[PDB]
Design a protein around this ligand. Structure first.
Ligand code: BTI
Ligand code: BTI
Ligand code: BTI
Lengths: 170, 506, 506, 506
């Protein structure tokens, strides 16, 4: 196709493409048109382009409907869909993350090798909490969401089965 | 005749605009809209559009909608022919009747005579009760076809609504089952009967929701965020697959180099053996443009199975995950990979097996659960497999598991090893306790006996002396090693003994 | 030379007379005595009697017994060639080495090149640790062979001692696994490791003893009282089996009549539908001389699988047991029958399927356990099977299960029915609640709506009008009907589409 | 249930006792009575006895008889399995519906899967109009089946009532068509339409009666006196035929000697060349117990096609009849033998060809009629045939015809000749007028030139010098020569080039 709809920072850009050998010419609704030129090719994690003569360096990643682009402090999913794709995608429900328990349950029946968090400490989403030793293999358990340690009830050398609450969060 | 145009447009309406909204309300696309996003823009040809059911019981004949609940036909995905059927939930709940199945059978029979995949989009309330045994027979004909086409033409199942009762058994037999995160579900018996019989009360989503199946039951291969990505991701899959069991995996351009070196790899296996590492890093760096379409990601996480391309050709990959259960092999991980292996084989897709398994997971749970049978399945798979098999052992390869992970004894082609590999009967410790009994009461003898076994056997070199490891390579060069290894195997041709079929443990 | 006679006699002594006593002490016979009772009196030819291992580590070379732990060779069972190996526990514990395997491989390779079954008598301590990876490799070659012969020549496994570790996987892949009531056991991981890793304490017999496996794990097919009957029963089994996948089931004289009538059958189905009856009664009366060799009797008891003969020819049988779980199909019953069917088909043995199933067993346990996949297996099995298939529905045939039990939609040849048969989408009750919603608040409407569905659909006649039941027969004549039905199918020949192999769910 | 017995007996009544009489009134037996005499006493197993049609138009659903117009199933003829369907004229005229055909397909599909002939007993008023296209589709599935089985399993059609419209095309494609002297008939279009479109007035019997077809159209293979002999002669026929294209002609005891001599034969060829003789005398004397089952006796009488046995094995025979058209080959004689040859070959039945043809029958009628194409058919048949081919030229073998009649150039195996044989380019007369033009004005030159061609070329010896006649034998020994000739060819195996199918002229 030639017609696409680029969906950025919550903004839709119905666009048309025409390309030959040199580069490509993207045209927007308002009649304006940019000229993209690039070395890029699938797989390249970094893209050095030349849009409207001015350098544009991006960090690329694959995503179902396009890619994850990162320019300045920017970092956003850029969906490149076709008009009917886009049209329908708009009928798709808005995903709401799962719920989190404020209780860190032990998922592997092993031995607690170390706890690197104190009571009343504040933790970042995904931060290393403790470390259970499985079968001569270390497993690092981490904060689900940012929160603050209510109470701990296990320490080095401890040996807990599944579900045993390791820590509690307020 | 613009009359034709009318009939056509009428049919396209399904159970009506009011029901279409209903559907959309559930965040669910319509049968037709799903077909629309699946197939190459304007390439869909529909069949049996005005088909009506033949029921006369329960005044069923007063409601004879066109299409009878399912949209069937063909089209292409990136120019390649594909057969499809999307159940239309808005028409009699997309309930299975004699004629609904018949429509599905026509394109299945067509997919088989022409050697092209079949994509099934299930979104049905279940059997059409009023049809009596006719609904059952309808299922039968689909089932039979599903069976005859197993390993003959790819059968990808897409569950995008409800799938209950006998129905579940069809997707069951297809090669893949994808579900849509929250709007879909499947189970043989409904939540209400589970209550009346088990006194247990549970919601459809709890009983057989996308999540329950993508990580507890072992039934689904992935749960997509919604209808749109689900359809997008399925084409992505189809792009890797061969069109049938005669041709080999498809080829396409690739902007990567078979001689790419990843020095980073040289330090992926941590020095401390109790410290994991993510096996997936390796996969990505080996995989072509770093693209890895994983299968059953959220289940049996102690093992990874997926698709990648090398020099633009599809290569299946089975690998151990140290991050979970310490890369152990267990009933579930076995069942998970075993099937993946067999599918790849049946369809001439090569296998790359990345190894780091300690042994199988201990437990009464496992033994009483039948690891003796399930565990065997993965072994059976590699034994049986005849596509090209390349293997790279990154660290641990001990005993039985060592053998099962595409060992040279299962007739794999290339058996590579990282210097950090350790192939042996069992760990130095336990090995020592068996070999040296009268020496335990001397904690320095056994402490030394182990220190020797370790120094003398925990490595890839004794295996090398034997020929079991064709070579020990520098980690950075793995992509280069493996790519050409397969390259040379493109012509591979090996014969298994004649038989109606196998008897693999169930 | 009488020197030869000496060496010979020498070898025959195994780990020596003191150990031979030890063995006998555990009520266990010796490798050689087991062989002796298995093969036709004096028909055993032994091979590699003086083979010695090639180990040099751990002073292993100072103990080079003859035979190296296993007795291999060939002989006959009722005059028919059979290949065998009996592990000699008294010799290095019958531990598996490079050379022990090799010995087993020799007769496996020979069984395949000549189309004769292989009887494996396992009674080993496990791998020969001192051999390092050579012990692993040894297992490999056995496995590979086990795999290649699957469904090509029968592989009957006899466990008469311990079977630990990788080893379990071989019998795992053979077509049958029989164990000896108390002197045998098998598990992937040892009870002691189960402790140090699960902190669970359990005895070998508890972990993987004959009972645990013939009843809980789904691994063994039967537990024999002792070494002597175990061997007698194995020959019995072999007498039914075909020697390989080329010839068809063996024939032999039979002192019974294909036209025999059992009037008793006419009252086998009880009047009250909540009252069971023993499906096995039927089996016996149909079976030729009333002989029925049951497989996995003590497992998945809600389904029966066995062998019988008709007009002196082998006929495999799958039947529903009302006595247990009310003849329901469930993960286990499914896995149990599924494999039986595939083996019988891979080996040209016809199938007789006796039906009386209500549906599948409801439950969170089942769905979370994956019935969608396991349930399918039996379906897959019948769908794939091409031997002659005859069916007799004695009573219940409802929904999905109805279809799965060798229905006519799976292309069975003869679909017979007793007048007491009831084939329908579901029970009258549930059916009614679905078909007549706006009628529940009137407990007489639904009481009547059900009374009609019951009167109009719960029977075999609607299926008859459709052709799905070739005929409704008088119970007493079943033996007569079925016998000739199979007779006329002796020439059956059906072709499944070409494919490397199937992709059946695992 | 004695309820079953009632339903059963109810069904057995067909269109009722009043119609049964009507039927019997026309000298016609009932569907079931015909089946009863066809199959080995009590060996019939009926299928789909309670099948009912699925029509809803024209109040068709108020008349839902059991069986829906046709009796299907299997049984044996002299112990050999045979599949059958007898149309029940008393039931909705034995009119073809969706379901009536389905029943026929079930046993056609069964005949093919088990390799057994299909005997079709047509006695139908034609399609079931109320069913609309479903009646058309009904025919379709039969036709298709009829086609796939052509030359794979013998298809004997028996017409014992009316057969009109598309219907005729089924028996058309079977291997044999027998009709019952006065009670049967068949034609694509009815006498009444023949009127309204041709203004020609003709009766059904005239249009397509047993006689019209057994001697004018070339459609039937024989007209039997009545229903009873019809049935009896069909089994007789079946006793000669192989059960399918895999096995070879059946064998049975034979009280006759392969070395029998018929001196009477030495004078069968009359001295005067203008006097016929009955080629059939020879056939009977050679035939085993003098038994000769003739095909299409009353048609293309200038040629004979039939079956006989030798040493108790089936042998097909094509031979020229001097008594008619002077044994000329003509469009019809050609079409008549051509197919016989092809059926015999398609089914491994050897051929014995007895020769005495002068050439082809001259005429504008022949040329405009396409002898170029029809004539070739027989040639094509022998050229293609690979079963064993023995030939005996009794007298005349001139030109083209000589070649067509299983000549040695068509790769026949034995090309025997009686001393009275005369193989040559054309007669001495004609030959002479061409070879010697400038000599006609001298009636003594040509009178002498002929006398020389006659004395030098009209015999079997010039052909013998060439090897074209393997040997010239004494007439009395023919039975002996031919019997062992075939005996020695029992192993014959010859390969034709690979191809989907032939393109023989139509
Ligand atoms: C150390 O904590 C004890 C060793 C644990 C045994 C490990 S667990 C998985 C490996 N495979 C196996 O059967 N045992 C090994
Ligand atoms: C009484 O009828 C209570 C309902 C039980 C339903 C039975 S239990 C097993 C059968 N299969 C199934 O899914 N439901 C049936
Ligand atoms: C004698 O009366 C004249 C010769 C007639 C020719 C005969 S008629 C049929 C034979 N075939 C042929 O072409 N010529 C022969």
């Amino acid at each position: 196709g030639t017609e696409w709809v680029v969906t950025l920072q919550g903004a839709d850009f119905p666009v048309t493409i025409a390309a030959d050998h040199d580069g490509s010419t993207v045209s927007f609704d308002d009649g304006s048109s940019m000229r993209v030129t690039s070395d890029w090719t699938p797989g390249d994690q970094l893209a050095n382009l030349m849009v409207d003569g001015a350098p544009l360096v991006l960090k690329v990643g694959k995503i179902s409907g396009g890619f994850r682009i990162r320019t300045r402090g920017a970092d956003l999913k850029v969906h490149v869909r076709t008009p009917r794709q886009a049209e329908l995608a708009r009928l798709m429900p808005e995903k709401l993350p799962p719920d989190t328990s404020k209780m860190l349950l032990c998922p592997m029946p092993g031995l607690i090798v170390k706890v690197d968090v104190e009571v009343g400490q504040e933790v970042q989403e995904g931060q290393a909490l403790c470390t259970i030793e499985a079968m001569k293999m270390e497993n690092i358990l981490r904060a689900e969401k940012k929160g603050v340690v209510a109470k701990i009830n296990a320490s080095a050398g401890n040996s807990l089965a599944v579900d045993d609450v390791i820590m509690e969060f307020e | 005749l613009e009359q034709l145009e009318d009939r056509r447009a009428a049919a396209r309406l399904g159970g009506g605009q009011k029901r279409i909204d209903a559907q959309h309300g559930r965040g669910k696309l319509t049968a037709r809209e799903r077909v629309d996003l699946l197939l190459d823009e304007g390439s869909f040809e529909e069949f049996d559009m005005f088909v009506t059911h033949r029921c006369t019981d329960f005044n069923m004949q007063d409601q004879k909608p066109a299409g009878d609940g399912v949209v069937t036909g063909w089209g292409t995905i990136n120019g390649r022919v594909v057969y499809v059927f999307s159940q239309d939930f808005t028409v009699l709940g997309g309930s299975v009747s004699e004629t609904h199945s018949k429509k599905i059978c026509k394109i299945m029979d067509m997919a088989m005579q022409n050697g092209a995949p079949v994509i099934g989009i299930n979104d049905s309330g279940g059997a059409r009760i009023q049809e009596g045994v006719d609904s059952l027979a309808g299922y039968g004909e689909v089932f039979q076809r599903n069976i005859m086409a197993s390993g003959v033409v790819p059968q990808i199942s897409m569950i995008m609504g409800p799938c209950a009762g006998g129905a579940v058994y069809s997707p069951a037999m297809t090669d893949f089952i994808f579900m849509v995160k929250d709007s879909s579900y499947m189970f043989v018996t409904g939540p209400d009967v589970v209550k009346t019989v088990t006194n247990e009360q549970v919601s459809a989503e709890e009983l057989g929701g996308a999540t329950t199946h993508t990580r507890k039951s072992s039934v689904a291969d992935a749960a997509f965020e919604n209808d749109v990505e689900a359809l997008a991701e399925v084409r992505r899959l189809v792009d890797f697959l061969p069109l049938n069991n005669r041709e080999k995996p498809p080829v396409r351009p690739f902007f990567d180099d078979p001689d790419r070196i990843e020095p980073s790899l040289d330090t992926l296996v941590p020095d401390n053996p109790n410290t994991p590492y993510d096996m997936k890093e390796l996969i990505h760096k080996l995989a072509d443009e770093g693209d890895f379409y994983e299968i059953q990601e959220e289940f049996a996480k102690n093992i990874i199975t997926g698709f990648i391309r090398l020099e633009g050709r599809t290569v299946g990959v089975v690998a151990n995950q140290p991050l979970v259960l310490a890369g152990c092999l267990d009933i579930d991980s076995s069942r998970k990979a075993a099937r993946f292996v067999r599918f790849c084989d049946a369809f001439e897709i090569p296998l790359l097996t990345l190894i780091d398994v300690p042994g199988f997971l201990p437990g009464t749970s496992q033994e009483y659960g039948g690891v003796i049978k399930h565990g065997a399945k993965l072994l059976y798979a590699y034994g049986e497999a005849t596509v090209p098999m390349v293997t790279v052992i990154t660290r641990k390869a001990y005993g039985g598991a060592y053998v099962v992970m595409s060992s040279k004894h299962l007739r794999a082609d290339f058996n590579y090893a990282w210097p950090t590999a350790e192939v042996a009967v069992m760990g130095a410790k336990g090995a020592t306790e068996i070999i040296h009994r009268g020496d335990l009461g001397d904690p320095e003898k056994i402490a030394q006996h182990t220190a020797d076994y370790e120094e003398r056997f925990a490595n890839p070199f004794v295996a090398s002396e034997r020929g079991f490891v064709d070579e020990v390579i520098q980690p950075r060069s793995t992509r280069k090693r493996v790519a050409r290894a397969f390259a040379s195997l493109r012509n591979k041709s090996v014969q298994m003994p004649w038989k109606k079929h196998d008897n693999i443990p169930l």
